[PDB]
Design a protein around this ligand. Structure first.
Ligand SMILES: *[C@@H]1O[C@H](CO)[C@@H](O)[C@H](O)[C@H]1NC(C)=O
Ligand SMILES: *[C@@H]1O[C@H](CO)[C@@H](O)[C@H](O)[C@H]1NC(C)=O
Ligand SMILES: *[C@@H]1O[C@H](CO)[C@@H](O)[C@H](O)[C@H]1NC(C)=O
Ligand SMILES: *[C@@H]1O[C@H](CO)[C@@H](O)[C@H](O)[C@H]1NC(C)=O
Ligand SMILES: *[C@@H]1O[C@H](CO)[C@@H](O)[C@H](O)[C@H]1NC(C)=O
Lengths: 475, 31, 97, 49, 100, 50, 50
């Protein structure tokens, strides 16, 4: 009856919306932000020593990493048995420090000046990484351990994608022995010119709110010299069913599964029946995306929470290193998928707001100028990329704002907002910087950005005019 | 049998090979 | 169309033929600048004070054990004649000195 | 006017003090032009510092 | 504030003053209708940003903070140095698509 | 102890020259995850009129 | 300075939350986030005065 169905598919969508909002409410609280912030400030902002001013975020050489390790790191891990980091956060297990390094004589120095250059170390690669015992081959810090025997995985840092193997060492449960171990590592040189990456991992609990937190710190030593630091703090949660609210959340997850099954059944019925060119409109290609993303999210959630063997293995013997990195990675992926699904589900609401004429004309205007905007956007973005590649090839060596193609695109978007100001392109090139900036601003503010408004305004005017004409004549 | 092998020796991606096969397709589409 | 597509391919191979050595250059120059402490040098005013900077950061960099290949020895130059007769201090010129 | 300023640093100190003490850089002083060159075999790039 | 706004009852009694008032009066319905869609999209983007950057950026720490940050992005007041490093993928996507 | 969750300090001043009180409150919050969050409020009250 | 300043405190009680059974022999006491339903009222320390 076109009224017993539109109202039928609207109440189901509304109930889906309340269920989704409830489900996403409990996964974001206000304790998580401060929990992360306190640890971040403790480990990243503390200067390496009472006399220096550099911190982990501004490391500059391999001699500052050694100050940080026996320094601001040990001050922030062992708090006066056990070690409660803020008298509340339990340092569970043992922190671990691992090194990835490449073998000597991996590259190929040229024949002529071979008299001066004695060795070279190639950039990091799985084919060119060292696997031999170096230095005083004594324990596990001087013996290569395979990735399988170490229960590791790739990381995808900044310079490259490092593997899960290398030379590792587990620190101690108290500061007195950890400092001695670090000093022993420093004496018998451990970070030579052949090292490429260094990882530090640990975790905390904070029993006040049932919420773990895994911490990873990376330092990358590129083959061209220098130091690049990176960090990651992830608030996991692995002991979910403790509170009645958590049982309510589990029920909500089950009900969400039921809606997703109902929606996939409805989609298959509507594809089988009465047409097979379903993928020709826009509101039909949005339901498929929603169900596919929801299925992927459900699969990820089932796969991630069904293997908590690492937590049980840690709870058996609590002197080991708690390996909670895979769980953190999967939590990040699940968060991304859930956020995108929620955004698209909220976008789906436009399918129902056509309840009167003033909304119907707006929808018609929006769906009638898409053909012209898509045609003009091709030209606009061809010119955009033409500017971006030129900026990348000219300024991309010595600005750091155009250092990569993505950075060029984002910088050119920020110029549109009036956020980037010419201070670096001058010192980079005092002659071509001004030309590039002036020409870009002129041809993408005064000319090319106002051709969207002309199209939109004319389309709105013509739609309103002919709709009114049709109304007057027919009725 | 030693002739055909899967090298995968180095991760140094080569752009000459992909830029030649990326133009012969756009040309074909437009033509 | 074919003429333009051949010209475009030649141009692309001319420009992005060795684009893999474009990310290494930025990191290399940044490392060189941070080793040389490229913030004190840019603040050097004439006070017979470039010598301590030269003896503090340059020489260890050039002759260090774990130093650069350096492709040969460095150098200094000098161009000049008839010293300035103490140009007027008050209200100095901005950049037209 | 060029100055070598190299050859086994324990010797370069002598050149530095000789340039400081025997009245080289003063009283005309229009340029000094420090210049060296870099080479990184790992990636295969030179550098004109 | 409301008492000061009420001056338009009396000041709109001459030509070129009633044209502006009539223009505001005959397009208020359309403005409300389009503000509904604009704010639906605004809230969708705000909730996405809250779910992705909600524990790291200090500008998206709460829902209200997300809404106010998104209002400030229009004026041209962003950092984008923390948005990108908080999430290398889906961080730039949010910014670019929102701006477009 | 570890059980504390907030701490308040309050007082007031007069400044008889221009008849205008001022009420001062300072708050320190200790979250369950460790740390300190400070806050303040200075309010220039006016009580004695006429 | 009118009168005397006053300093006040709010605190939650020990065992206001539930430690999971797995590591109950590891961590002894927990204090929840602030709430009226979970606020301490017993005397503590040298319970002399206010
Ligand atoms: C590195 O290998 C080269 C041979 O390619 C050798 O001459 C050099 O001594 C080695 N450097 C070491 C072992 O530190
Ligand atoms: C190697 O280990 C032994 C005992 O495990 C220790 O006594 C020694 O100091 C270590 N280092 C060496 C031999 O360089
Ligand atoms: C890797 O496998 C398990 C972890 O579940 C553990 O028994 C083993 O000791 C781990 N290996 C190392 C080196 O920690
Ligand atoms: C807190 O209460 C538990 C019992 O629930 C007890 O074992 C523990 O000692 C108490 N802690 C303090 C500081 O009184
Ligand atoms: C408690 O007793 C009196 C007041 O009742 C006080 O003078 C004394 O110092 C207090 N004892 C302490 C603080 O140990």
């Amino acid at each position: 009856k076109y009224l017993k169905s539109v109202l039928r598919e609207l109440v189901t969508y509304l109930l889906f919306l309340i269920v989704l909002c409830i489900l996403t409410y409990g996964m974001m609280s206000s304790n998580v932000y401060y929990y992360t912030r306190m640890m971040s400030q403790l480990f990243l902002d503390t200067p390496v020593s009472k006399t220096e001013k550099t911190n982990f975020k501004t490391l500059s050489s391999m001699e500052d990493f050694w100050k940080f390790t026996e320094g601001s790191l040990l001050d922030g891990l062992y708090w006066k048995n056990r070690s409660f980091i803020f008298y509340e956060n339990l340092l569970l297990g043992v922190p671990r420090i691992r090194q990835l390094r490449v073998r000597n004589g991996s590259c190929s120095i040229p024949q002529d000046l071979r008299d001066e250059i004695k060795e070279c170390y190639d950039v990091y690669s799985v084919s060119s990484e060292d696997r031999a015992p170096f230095g005083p081959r004594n324990g596990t810090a001087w013996i290569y351990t395979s990735e399988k025997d170490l229960n590791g995985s790739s990381h995808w840092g900044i310079i490259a994608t490092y593997s899960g193997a290398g030379y590792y060492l587990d620190l101690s449960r108290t500061r007195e022995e950890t400092a001695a171990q670090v000093a022993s590592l420093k004496k018998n040189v451990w970070l030579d010119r052949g090292t490429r990456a260094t990882f530090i991992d640990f975790s905390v609990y904070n029993a006040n709110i049932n919420l773990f937190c895994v911490v990873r710190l990376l330092v990358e030593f590129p083959a061209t010299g220098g130091v690049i630091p990176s960090w990651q703090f992830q608030p996991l949660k692995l002991i979910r069913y403790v509170t009645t609210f958590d049982f309510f959340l589990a029920a909500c997850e089950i009900i969400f599964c039921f809606f997703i099954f109902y929606y996939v059944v409805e989609e298959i019925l509507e594809i089988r029946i009465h047409k097979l060119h379903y993928f020709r409109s826009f509101w039909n290609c949005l339901d498929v995306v929603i169900v596919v993303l929801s299925v992927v999210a459900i699969g990820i959630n089932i796969y991630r929470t069904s293997n908590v063997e690492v937590l049980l293995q840690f709870l058996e013997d609590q002197n080991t290193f708690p390996n909670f990195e895979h769980l953190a990675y999967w939590q990040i992926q699940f968060n991304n998928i859930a956020a995108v699904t929620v955004f698209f589900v909220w976008i789906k609401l436009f399918k129902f707001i056509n309840f009167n004429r003033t909304m119907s004309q707006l929808s018609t205007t929006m769906s009638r100028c898409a053909k012209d905007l898509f045609g003009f956007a091709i030209m606009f973005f061809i010119i955009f990329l033409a500017y971006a590649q030129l900026a990348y090839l000219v300024f991309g060596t010595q600005v750091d704002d155009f250092s990569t193609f993505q950075e060029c695109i984002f910088t050119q978007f920020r110029i549109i907002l009036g956020d980037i100001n010419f201070a670096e392109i001058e010192e980079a090139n005092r002659v071509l910087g001004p030309i590039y900036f002036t020409t870009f601003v002129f041809f993408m503010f005064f000319i090319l950005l106002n051709m969207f408004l002309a199209i939109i305004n004319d389309t709105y005017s013509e739609v309103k005019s002919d709709l009114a004409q049709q109304k007057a004549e027919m009725e | 049998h030693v002739r055909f092998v899967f090298p995968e020796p180095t991760a140094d991606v080569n752009y000459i090979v992909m830029l030649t096969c990326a133009v012969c397709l756009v040309t074909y589409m437009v033509m | 169309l074919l003429v333009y597509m051949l010209f475009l391919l030649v141009t692309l191979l001319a420009s992005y033929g060795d684009a893999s050595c474009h990310g290494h250059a930025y990191r290399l120059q940044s490392a060189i600048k941070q080793e040389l402490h490229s913030r004190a040098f840019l603040a050097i005013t004439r006070s017979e004070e470039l010598w301590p900077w030269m003896a503090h950061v340059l020489l260890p960099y050039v002759h260090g054990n774990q130093s650069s290949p350096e492709l040969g020895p460095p150098r200094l130059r000098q161009v000049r004649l008839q010293e300035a007769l103490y140009p007027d201090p008050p209200g100095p010129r901005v950049h037209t000195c | 006017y060029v100055q070598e300023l190299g050859l086994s640093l324990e010797e370069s100190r002598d050149r530095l003090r000789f340039l400081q003490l025997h009245n080289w850089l003063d009283n005309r002083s229009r340029a000094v032009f420090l210049e060296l060159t870099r080479y990184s075999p790992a990636v295969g790039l030179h550098a004109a510092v």
